[PDB]
Structure 1
Amino acid sequence: QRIIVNPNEPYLSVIKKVVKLSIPIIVVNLLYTVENMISMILVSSISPSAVAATGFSLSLLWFIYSLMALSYSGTNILIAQFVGAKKDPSPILINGLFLSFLISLPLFFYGKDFVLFLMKVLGASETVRSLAKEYLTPIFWFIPIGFLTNTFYGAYNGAGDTKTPMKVAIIMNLTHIGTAYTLINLGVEGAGWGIAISEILAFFIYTFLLIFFKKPFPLHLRLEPKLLFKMVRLGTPTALERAITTLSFNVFVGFLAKFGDKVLAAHQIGLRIESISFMIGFGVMIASTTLAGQNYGARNYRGMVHAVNTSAHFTALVMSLTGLILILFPHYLVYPFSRDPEVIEWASYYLQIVGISQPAMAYASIYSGALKGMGKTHIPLFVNISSFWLFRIIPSYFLLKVIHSPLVPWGFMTFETAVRALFYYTVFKKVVGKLL
C-alpha cells in the first residue's frame, strides 16, 4: 500500500526497500538476456541464414520497440504519483492500455511489410526475405498483445509491485523457450510463435488476476479521457530518448569500425560484460521512478530527496565494487570470448577504462529515474542526448583526426558518463530547490 520514504528514515531502512523493488526488475531483465541467448541457440540449429534473419530483425525491433516507451512512461509515472497521493489509479491503467492498443495499430498489418521492404539494403535475397517473413508473421500478428503486456509491467512497477511481473516473466521465459524448442524442431516460424504465445499467455495471466485478484488496483470505471494527453506528453520524451540514443550508438560504434575487425569485436565483447553490469542500473532506475514518483505524489519532498540520495550513494558503492572487479580482472572476464590475444588486448583496455565510470554511471540512472518519477521526462532526453554528442562524439570526432588511437573513443566515453553524472546532480539539485 504505497512505499513512502520518511525524511529521517535510517540509511539501512531505505536501501533494504530499494532492493525489494530493484531485484525483481533486474531478474526480469536478466531473464530477458537468457531468453534471447537461448533463442540464438534455437535459431542456429538448422541453416545459418536463419541466424542472419533473426539478428537483423531483433535489432530492427529495438528501433521499433521505442513506441512502447510512450505507453509505459505514461502508465508507470502517473500510477506511481496517484498511488502516492492516495488516489484511485484506475483511469490510468486502461487509458494506457487503450493507448498502447492504439500506437500498436500502425505496426499491425503495415509494420509487417516495413521490415520486408527494408530488407533490400544489405543483400537480402528472396531466401533471406522468405525466412525472415516466417519469423515475423506471428510476431507482427500479435503486437497489441505485446503492447498491452508492457503497460501491465509499467502499471505493476508504478504501483510498487515488481515481484508479480517477475513471476509472470519467469512463466513467460519458460513458455517462450518451451514453445520455440518444440516448434523449431517445423520452420523458423516456431521461434516467432514462441514470442507470440509467450505474450498471449502473459496477457491471459495479466488479464486473469485483474478480473479475479489484486492487480495494481481493483480496476473500476474510468471517467477521465483527458489524462492520456498527459500520458502522451510524458511518454513522448522517453520514446524519443531511447530511439535517438540507439541512433547515436551506431555513430559512436562507427568510430571503432575504422580500427579493423578486431576492435569492433573487442567493443562488443566489453559491451556484453557492460550489459551484465547494466541490468543493475536500469532496474534501480525503474525502482527510483517508482519510489520518487510515489513520494512526489504524496507531496513528501523531504523524504523523496532522502530516498534518492540514499539509493544514489548505495548504488554508487555497488558499482564501485563492479568497477573494481572490471579493472582488476579484465582478462578473466574476456575468457569466454577470448579468441585472438590481440582482441583480449583491446577488451582489457576497454573494461579498465569504463570501470572507472561505473559509479558515475549509477548517478545517471538513479537521477534519471527520480526525475522521470517527478514527471520531468524531458530532462533525461535533454541530458542524455546533448552530453552524448558535445562530450562524446564531437570531442572524439576531432581528436581521432590527429591522435589516432582506438582508446580515444573509449576515453571520451568514460569522461562523458562522468560529465553526464555531474549534470544530473545539478538539475536535480535545482529541481529539489524549487520544490522546497
Structure 2
Amino acid sequence: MQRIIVNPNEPYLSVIKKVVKLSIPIIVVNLLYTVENMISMILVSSISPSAVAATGFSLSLLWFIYSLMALSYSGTNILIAQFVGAKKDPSPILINGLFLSFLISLPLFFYGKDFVLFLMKVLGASETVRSLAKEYLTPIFWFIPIGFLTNTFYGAYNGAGDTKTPMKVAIIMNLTHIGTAYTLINGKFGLPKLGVEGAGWGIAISEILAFFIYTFLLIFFKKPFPLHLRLEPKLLFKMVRLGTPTALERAITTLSFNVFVGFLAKFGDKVLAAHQIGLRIESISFMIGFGVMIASTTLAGQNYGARNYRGMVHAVNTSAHFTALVMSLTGLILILFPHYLVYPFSRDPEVIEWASYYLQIVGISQPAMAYASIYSGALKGMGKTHIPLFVNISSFWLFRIIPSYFLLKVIHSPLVPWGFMTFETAVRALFYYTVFKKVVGKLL
C-alpha cells in the first residue's frame, strides 16, 4: 500500500487536496448514518409512541455500549496507519484487530441485551416499553459480533488511507437497512408485519451484508491488505494498550453528557426539547470536524510511522486552519439563520426561541471545535490515545459541568449551561493546541 506523505514545504492546496480526499468519504459515511436514523425513526413512529420510546431508549444505551468498539477500532486504525507510513506489512494488524474485535464483542453477545434492559428499567421505562425494546434488541445482539468486525474493517481502511471503500459499503448498507426495516415493519409486499422487531432486523441484516462485502473484498481482492491467518499476542496487547483509553473516553463522555443534559431537564420539557433539536442541527456541523478528525489520524499516523515529523506537523496545521475556516462558515450560518434551521423540527414558539438561542451561542464555538477535532486525531495517530481522554474529560467537568452547577444556583437560565458549553469548547481547543505544541516540540 502506498503512503500519503505530506512534505514539510508542500503547498497549502496540495495538502488540502489530500485532506479532502480522505475526509469527504468519512463525512458521507457519517451523514448517511444521520439520514438513516431519521428515516428509521419515522418508520418506527408508524407503529406506536411506545415503539418510539423503546427504540429511543435502546439507541441511546446501544450508543453507550458501542464505546467498546473504539477499543478494536482505534488499535487497528492507528497501527495500520503507522505501519503503512513505515513501509511495514500491515496484514498482521488487520487479522489481529478483527479477532480482537470479535473477542470483545462476546460479552455483549452473551449478556448485553439483559444489561441494556437492566439499564432501561432504571430510566423509568414501563414494562411494555421494555418488552418492545427486547424485541427490537434481539436481532441486534444476535449479530453484534458482526457489527464489531465491520467497524474494525472500517478502521483498517481508514488507517490505510482508503476511505472510499467503506463509503461504498455504507451506501449499500444504508439502503439495505432502510429497505429491510420498511419492509418488515409495515409488512410490505406480502411479508409479515414484525413491528419493532423489523427495525432491529434492519440493523442486523445491513451489518451482515456489510460484513459479507468486506470479507468478499478480503478473500478475492486482498482488502486493504492480504489475509494472513496468524494471531500475534504482542500485537493484541499493543492494540489493547492503544484502544483502552479511547473506549474509556467515549464511555465517560456519554456519562458526563448525561449529567450535563440533566441541568437542562430541570427547566422543563420545552427547554429540553429545544436542546435536543439544537443538538441534531449542530451535528451536521459536528460530522465535518469528525470526518477530518478521522482523516487527521490517518495523515498523522502515516507520516509519524514514516518518521516524517515536520511533514506530519505541516499536515496537521494545514488541516486545522482549513477545517476552522469551513466551520467558521457553518457556525456563521447557525448564528444568522437559526429560525430557518429550527423550522423543520417544531413550531412551538417558545421552543423555537430556546433552540435558536442555543444555535447562536454554540455557533461561535464551531472553529474551536475544529481545532480540537484535528489535534485529537493527530494525537491518536501518534499513538497518544490517553491524551484525548485526559483533555476531554478534564475540560468537560472543570470548564463546563462544574461552573454550570455553581452559577445555576444564582442564575436560573438555560443560557448558563449553553454559555459554558461554548466557553469549554474554546478552552478545550486551546488545551489541545498547547499539548500538541509540546508533544511536537519534543518530536522535533
Shared fold per TM-score greater than 0.5: yes
CA–CA distance in 2 between the matches of 1:344 and 1:187? 33
| SS of corresponding position for 1:121 | helix
CA–CA distance in 1 between the matches of 2:370 and 2:119? 37
Deviates further, 232-241 or 41-50: 41-50
* Superposed CA offset, 1:256-288 (max 9, x none): 122222211111111111111101010010000
How far does residue 375 in structure 1 lie from its aligned partner after superposition? 0.2
How far does residue 349 in structure 1 lie from its aligned partner after superposition? 1.4
Contact 1:241/1:380 (<8 A) preserved:
yes
Distance 1:128 1:347, change over 3 A: closer
Contact 2:95/2:228 (<8 A) preserved:
no
How far does residue 404 in structure 1 lie from its aligned partner after superposition? 2.4
- TM-score for the superposition, normalised by structure 1: 0.98
How far does residue 123 in structure 1 lie from its aligned partner after superposition? 4.7
How far does residue 42 in structure 1 lie from its aligned partner after superposition? 1.4
CA–CA distance in 2 between the matches of 1:28 and 1:60? 22
Structure 1 runs (4+) greater than 4 angstroms displaced:
none
CA-based RMSD of the aligned residues comes to 1.2
How far does residue 8 in structure 1 lie from its aligned partner after superposition? 0.7
How far does residue 73 in structure 1 lie from its aligned partner after superposition? 0.2
Deviates further, 48-57 or 298-307: 48-57
* Superposed CA offset, 1:303-348 (max 9, x none): 0000000000000000111111111112121111242212222222
State the partner residue of 2:342.
334
* Superposed CA offset, 1:121-176 (max 9, x none): 34544433332222111111111111110110000000000000000000000111
CA–CA distance in 1 between the matches of 2:127 and 2:392? 40
How far does residue 219 in structure 1 lie from its aligned partner after superposition? 2.6
Deviates further, 160-169 or 194-203: 194-203
* Superposed CA offset, 1:242-262 (max 9, x none): 110111111111111222222
State the partner residue of 1:26.
27
Deviates further, 147-156 or 42-51: 42-51
* Superposed CA offset, 1:74-113 (max 9, x none): 0000000000000000111111111011111101121122
Contact 1:295/1:301 (<8 A) preserved:
yes
- TM-score for the superposition, normalised by structure 2: 0.96
Deviates further, 363-372 or 319-328: 319-328
| SS of corresponding position for 2:221 | coil
How far does residue 223 in structure 1 lie from its aligned partner after superposition? 5.9
Q: Which runs of 5+ in 1 are unaligned?
A: none
1:429 aligns with 2:437: yes
* Superposed CA offset, 1:1-38 (max 9, x none): 11110111100000011011111001111000111111
CA–CA distance in 1 between the matches of 2:341 and 2:248? 34
How far does residue 199 in structure 1 lie from its aligned partner after superposition? 0.8
Distance 1:202 1:123, change over 3 A: same
* Superposed CA offset, 1:387-407 (max 9, x none): 111111111111111122221
Contact 1:90/1:222 (<8 A) preserved:
no
Contact 2:265/2:271 (<8 A) preserved:
yes
State the partner residue of 2:121.
120
Distance 1:119 1:431, change over 3 A: closer
Contact 2:47/2:195 (<8 A) preserved:
no
Q: Which runs of 5+ in 2 are unaligned?
A: 187-193
Tell me the percent identity.
Answer: 100
Distance 1:137 1:232, change over 3 A: same
Equivalences, count:
436
Distance 1:128 1:168, change over 3 A: same
CA–CA distance in 2 between the matches of 1:119 and 1:223? 38
Deviates further, 25-34 or 35-44: 35-44
Distance 1:294 1:69, change over 3 A: same
Contact 2:70/2:243 (<8 A) preserved:
yes
Contact 1:90/1:221 (<8 A) preserved:
no
State the partner residue of 2:189.
none
| SS of corresponding position for 1:324 | helix
Which aligned pairs between 1:204-353 and structure 2 lie closer than 5 A?
Answer: 204-222=212-230, 224-353=232-361
Deviates further, 41-50 or 353-362: 41-50
Contact 2:335/2:363 (<8 A) preserved:
yes
CA–CA distance in 1 between the matches of 2:103 and 2:231? 19
CA–CA distance in 2 between the matches of 1:120 and 1:342? 32
How far does residue 293 in structure 1 lie from its aligned partner after superposition? 0.4
CA–CA distance in 2 between the matches of 1:220 and 1:179? 34
| SS of corresponding position for 1:182 | helix
CA–CA distance in 2 between the matches of 1:122 and 1:391? 27
CA–CA distance in 2 between the matches of 1:282 and 1:247? 20
